[PDB]
């Protein structure tokens, strides 16, 4: 059946090592600040499109919100604009910076900053104070404002009481690999799961979902924006009513007496199909 796979941590470590080339180094969802599907949803639900986001055809004419007449408070003579109200402001807070927001989506506000250090040299121990980590004040603090216990007068502990986990290496060779896998992208975060088909594994998917391939010609931008538009339109309409009866028509055709089964090379099958099409 080859449907579910149960594997081990080192295999994920080595596969992630090999696939680092095709996988971005982003680990925190805050990088997809205004490029997550909800931001594009609320951009499409409005006329305004973010500079990194594709344009869209408005759902309705929306002539009511197109050019409203000047009102007593809507007059620009009273509104003060210190900074332009860019599309970022509208997408971030659709219910505040947008008159008549109507049917919109809600975007995630924030995720705690992933404070992770990627392993640089395997030989060096994992539980090591990396130089990038800021130093802390190792103050002597001869003062004793904190409470202090008795001096060699109490706390008689039995010798059979060990500090629990003992005779076990605190740092092992596999600690770095596992702790790196713990912050892997979606495919490698799972220790073991179910298979997916070959054709529905989009490798380039994580690429355009990034903010931008910085340092690119205009045509690259246009291609990225258009393909993001296609992806977001695919994401919008996604509901299966298909409560099928699991009638495997292909299996029934296989069971039909008019056809038989055999084994052959793929190239032979290809030439057979070419002859059949001719």
């Amino acid at each position: 059946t080859y449907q579910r796979w149960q594997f081990t941590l080192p295999m994920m470590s080595t596969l992630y090592r090999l696939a680092n080339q095709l996988l971005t180094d982003l680990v925190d969802d805050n990088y997809f600040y205004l490029f997550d599907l909800k931001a594009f949803f609320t951009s499409k639900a409005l006329n305004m499109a973010i500079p990194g986001g594709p344009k869209f055809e408005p759902l309705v004419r929306d002539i009511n919100l197109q050019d409203e007449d000047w009102n007593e408070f809507n007059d620009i003579n009273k509104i003060i604009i210190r900074q332009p109200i860019r599309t970022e402001y509208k997408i971030a807070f659709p219910y505040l910076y947008n008159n008549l927001p109507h049917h919109v989506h809600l975007t995630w506000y924030h995720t705690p900053n992933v404070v992770f250090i990627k392993t640089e040299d395997p030989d060096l121990p994992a539980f090591y104070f990396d130089p990038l980590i800021n130093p802390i004040s190792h103050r002597h603090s001869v003062k004793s404002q904190e409470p202090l216990p008795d001096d060699d007068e109490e706390f008689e502990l039995p010798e059979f009481v060990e500090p629990f986990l003992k005779d076990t290496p605190l740092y092992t060779d596999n600690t770095a690999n596992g702790i790196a896998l713990l912050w892997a992208p979606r495919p490698f975060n799972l220790r073991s799961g179910r298979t997916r088909r070959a054709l529905d594994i989009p490798l380039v998917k994580n690429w355009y979902r990034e903010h931008c391939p910085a340092g690119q010609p205009v045509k690259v931008r246009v291609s990225y924006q258009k393909l993001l538009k296609y992806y977001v339109l695919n994401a919008l309409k996604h509901r299966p009513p298909k409560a099928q009866k699991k009638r495997y028509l292909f299996r029934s055709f296989k069971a039909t007496k008019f056809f038989q089964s055999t084994k052959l090379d793929w190239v032979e099958v290809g030439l057979q199909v070419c002859r059949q099409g001719y």
Binding site: I50, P54, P84, P131, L132, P135, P213, V218
Partner: protein, 98 residues
């Protein structure tokens, strides 16, 4: 130009024929705001490695701020270990280029 750009931006805010491929007239990334136009690339403090960007080029294209800070903060033993690691990496690179 930037002041006039903001001016007309605020004004806009308030006041068959087969085609072979896409056209550049649909680009939306053109924003006059220099902060938005020039966005600081997220290098993850020396840990940002984009997929398609060449690893060696990315190391060259890296701002080296994190690398320089780590070199300054590294102790003598840490500096020696880093020197040995980079020497081994250079030997490996020479082996591949051979």
């Amino acid at each position: 130009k930037d002041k006039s750009k903001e001016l007309h931006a605020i004004k806009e805010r308030y006041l068959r024929k087969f085609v072979f491929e896409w056209d550049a007239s649909e680009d939306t990334s053109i924003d006059y705001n220099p902060l938005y136009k020039e966005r600081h690339q997220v290098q993850l403090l020396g840990r940002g490695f984009i997929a398609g960007i060449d690893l060696k080029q990315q190391k060259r294209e890296q701002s080296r701020f994190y690398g320089d800070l780590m070199e300054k903060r590294r102790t003598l033993e840490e500096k020696e270990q880093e020197e040995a690691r980079l020497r081994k990496l250079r030997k490996k690179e020479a082996k591949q280029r051979w």
